[PDB]
Design an enzyme around this catalytic site. Structure first.
Site, PDB file in Angstrom:
ATOM      1  N   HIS A  61     -27.670  15.185  30.984  1.00 21.31           N
ATOM      2  CA  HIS A  61     -28.312  15.454  32.270  1.00 21.31           C
ATOM      3  C   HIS A  61     -28.093  14.217  33.268  1.00 21.31           C
ATOM      4  O   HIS A  61     -28.223  14.353  34.459  1.00 21.31           O
ATOM      5  CB  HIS A  61     -29.779  15.741  32.254  1.00 21.31           C
ATOM      6  CG  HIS A  61     -30.614  14.845  31.403  1.00 21.31           C
ATOM      7  ND1 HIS A  61     -30.739  15.167  30.035  1.00 21.31           N
ATOM      8  CD2 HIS A  61     -31.388  13.743  31.659  1.00 21.31           C
ATOM      9  CE1 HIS A  61     -31.533  14.207  29.540  1.00 21.31           C
ATOM     10  NE2 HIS A  61     -31.909  13.361  30.482  1.00 21.31           N
ATOM     11  N   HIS A  91     -30.974   4.839  34.870  1.00 19.70           N
ATOM     12  CA  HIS A  91     -30.072   6.024  35.117  1.00 19.70           C
ATOM     13  C   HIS A  91     -30.118   6.369  36.587  1.00 19.70           C
ATOM     14  O   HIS A  91     -30.926   5.775  37.331  1.00 19.70           O
ATOM     15  CB  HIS A  91     -30.407   7.229  34.199  1.00 19.70           C
ATOM     16  CG  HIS A  91     -31.893   7.549  34.436  1.00 19.70           C
ATOM     17  ND1 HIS A  91     -32.838   7.025  33.661  1.00 19.70           N
ATOM     18  CD2 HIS A  91     -32.402   8.438  35.361  1.00 19.70           C
ATOM     19  CE1 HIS A  91     -34.013   7.547  34.148  1.00 19.70           C
ATOM     20  NE2 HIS A  91     -33.752   8.425  35.136  1.00 19.70           N
ATOM     21  N   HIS A  93     -29.537   9.737  39.597  1.00 19.97           N
ATOM     22  CA  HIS A  93     -29.648  11.107  40.060  1.00 19.97           C
ATOM     23  C   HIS A  93     -28.762  11.103  41.321  1.00 19.97           C
ATOM     24  O   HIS A  93     -28.925  10.175  42.070  1.00 19.97           O
ATOM     25  CB  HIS A  93     -30.979  11.683  40.414  1.00 19.97           C
ATOM     26  CG  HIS A  93     -32.003  11.529  39.343  1.00 19.97           C
ATOM     27  ND1 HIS A  93     -32.315  12.572  38.472  1.00 19.97           N
ATOM     28  CD2 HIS A  93     -32.664  10.368  38.946  1.00 19.97           C
ATOM     29  CE1 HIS A  93     -33.156  12.026  37.594  1.00 19.97           C
ATOM     30  NE2 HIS A  93     -33.426  10.719  37.889  1.00 19.97           N
ATOM     31  N   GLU A 103     -34.326  11.895  44.513  1.00 22.91           N
ATOM     32  CA  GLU A 103     -35.408  12.746  44.011  1.00 22.91           C
ATOM     33  C   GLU A 103     -36.613  12.538  45.043  1.00 22.91           C
ATOM     34  O   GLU A 103     -37.155  13.450  45.625  1.00 22.91           O
ATOM     35  CB  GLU A 103     -35.801  12.294  42.633  1.00 22.91           C
ATOM     36  CG  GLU A 103     -34.574  12.650  41.633  1.00 22.91           C
ATOM     37  CD  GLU A 103     -35.177  12.838  40.291  1.00 22.91           C
ATOM     38  OE1 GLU A 103     -35.845  12.004  39.724  1.00 22.91           O
ATOM     39  OE2 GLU A 103     -34.897  14.042  39.877  1.00 22.91           O
ATOM     40  N   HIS A 116     -33.167   4.737  38.720  1.00 18.97           N
ATOM     41  CA  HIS A 116     -34.456   4.633  38.038  1.00 18.97           C
ATOM     42  C   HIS A 116     -34.310   3.621  36.913  1.00 18.97           C
ATOM     43  O   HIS A 116     -33.501   3.881  36.041  1.00 18.97           O
ATOM     44  CB  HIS A 116     -34.997   5.902  37.469  1.00 18.97           C
ATOM     45  CG  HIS A 116     -35.280   6.982  38.496  1.00 18.97           C
ATOM     46  ND1 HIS A 116     -35.180   8.312  38.190  1.00 18.97           N
ATOM     47  CD2 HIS A 116     -35.700   6.838  39.758  1.00 18.97           C
ATOM     48  CE1 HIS A 116     -35.503   8.943  39.307  1.00 18.97           C
ATOM     49  NE2 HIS A 116     -35.832   8.083  40.330  1.00 18.97           N
ATOM     50  N   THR A 195     -39.331  12.763  35.886  1.00 21.40           N
ATOM     51  CA  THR A 195     -38.774  13.857  36.672  1.00 21.40           C
ATOM     52  C   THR A 195     -37.893  14.831  35.896  1.00 21.40           C
ATOM     53  O   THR A 195     -37.495  15.843  36.551  1.00 21.40           O
ATOM     54  CB  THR A 195     -38.074  13.244  37.917  1.00 21.40           C
ATOM     55  OG1 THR A 195     -36.975  12.517  37.449  1.00 21.40           O
ATOM     56  CG2 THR A 195     -39.089  12.360  38.738  1.00 21.40           C
TER      57      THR A 195
END
Ligand SMILES: [Hg+2]
Ligand SMILES: [Zn+2]
Length: 256
Positions: A61, A91, A93, A103, A116, A195
Site C-alpha cells: 500500500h 512512508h 502517500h 492526506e 509520515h 490513516t
C-alpha cells in the site's frame, strides 16, 4: 482485502473496520482561521542524529523505510507530547497527478505527497502495546510540493527499482531522515488515528506548516511502484491516500 480502488477503496473500509467512522479519525482538513494558537505549546524536539535505518520494503500500500527501535536512537519529544517517542518507520502517500497525494489538507489545499514519520510511546515498551493506548503514537506529517529537487530524498528514489512489487525488500542502512525536514518546526496538532486499516485511534498528529519541495522526476519514481506482487497484472501504486474525515468537535491547535 482493503486497497485504494473502486471496489476496495476508502469508502468501503468501514465494513471490515467499523472504527472508520469513529470519533477521532484521520486525515482532516486544517482550517487555518479556526485553528487555536496555544501559547502553552512547547517547541518540538527532533533528536535524529543517531538514527539507524535498516531496510526499505513494498508492503503493498506504500513503501516503508524501517529503523532499529530497540534503543532511544531516533526520538521525538516536546510539542504537545509527554514522554519520548521512538521512530519506527517513515512512508509517503502520493497521487497520480501533482494536484493530489496528501492526506491532510490546509484550507482545502491538497499537496502532491505527504510524509509520515511514525513514532511510538516508549512507556508502553513495544509498538504493539502502544497501539492499544490513546496516546500510543505520534506521527510527524510533512507536506511535499513539486519544485526543486530535494537532495536528501534521492537515495530513497534510487532504491525504488529494487522493491517494485509487493513484498519485496532491500537493505537500506545509513539513511539520515534529517534530510527530509523543512527549515521551520512550526506545526498544528490534534488527536486522531492511523490513516490505513486498522485505523486505530491512538495518534497525536504533528503536521508541519512548511512543505518541502521535491522535483517532478522524484515524484515520478514513486508512481512506478506497483500495488501488486511480482507475476500479477500491473497496478500502478498511485493515489494511496485517504480523504479528509469529519473533525467532530475536536480542536486543532497551532504552535504559531
Ligand atoms: Hg489506541
Ligand atoms: Zn501514512
Amino acid at each position: 482485502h482493503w486497497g485504494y480502488g473502486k471496489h476496495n477503496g476508502p469508502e468501503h473500509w468501514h465494513k471490515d473496520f467499523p472504527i472508520a467512522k469513529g470519533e477521532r479519525q484521520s486525515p482532516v482538513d486544517i482550517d487555518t482561521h479556526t485553528a487555536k494558537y496555544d501559547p502553552s505549546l512547547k517547541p518540538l524536539s527532533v533528536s535524529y542524529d543517531q538514527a539507524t535505518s535498516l531496510r526499505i520494503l513494498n508492503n503493498g500500500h506504500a513503501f516503508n523505510v524501517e529503523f532499529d527501535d530497540s534503543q532511544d536512537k531516533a526520538v521525538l519529544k516536546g510539542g504537545p507530547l509527554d514522554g519520548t517517542y521512538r521512530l519506527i518507520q517513515f512512508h509517503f502517500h502520493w497521487g497520480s497527478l501533482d494536484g493530489q497525494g496528501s492526506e491532510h489538507t490546509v484550507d482545502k489545499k491538497k499537496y502532491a505527497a505527504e510524509l509520515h514519520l511514525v513514532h511510538w510511546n516508549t512507556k508502553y515498551g513495544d509498538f504493539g502495546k502502544a497501539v492499544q493506548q490513546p496516546d500510543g503514537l505520534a506521527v510527524l506529517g510533512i507536506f511535499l510540493k513539486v519544485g526543486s529537487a530535494k537532495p536528501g530524498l534521492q537515495k530513497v528514489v534510487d532504491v525504488l527499482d529494487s522493491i517494485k512489487t509487493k513484498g519485496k525488500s532491500a537493505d537500506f542502512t545509513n539513511f539520515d531522515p534529517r534530510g527530509l525536514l523543512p527549515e521551520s518546526l512550526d506545526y498544528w496538532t490534534y488527536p486522531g488515528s492511523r490513516t490505513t486499516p486498522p485505523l486505530l485511534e491512538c495518534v497525536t498528529w504533528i503536521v508541519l506548516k512548511e512543505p518541502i519541495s521535491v522535483s517532478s522526476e522524484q515524484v515520478l519514481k514513486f508512481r512506478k511502484l506497483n500495488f501488486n506482487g511480482e507475476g500479477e497484472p500491473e497496478e500502478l501504486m498511485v493515489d494511496n491516500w485517504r480523504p479528509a474525515q469529519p473533525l467532530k468537535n475536536r480542536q486543532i491547535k497551532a504552535s504559531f
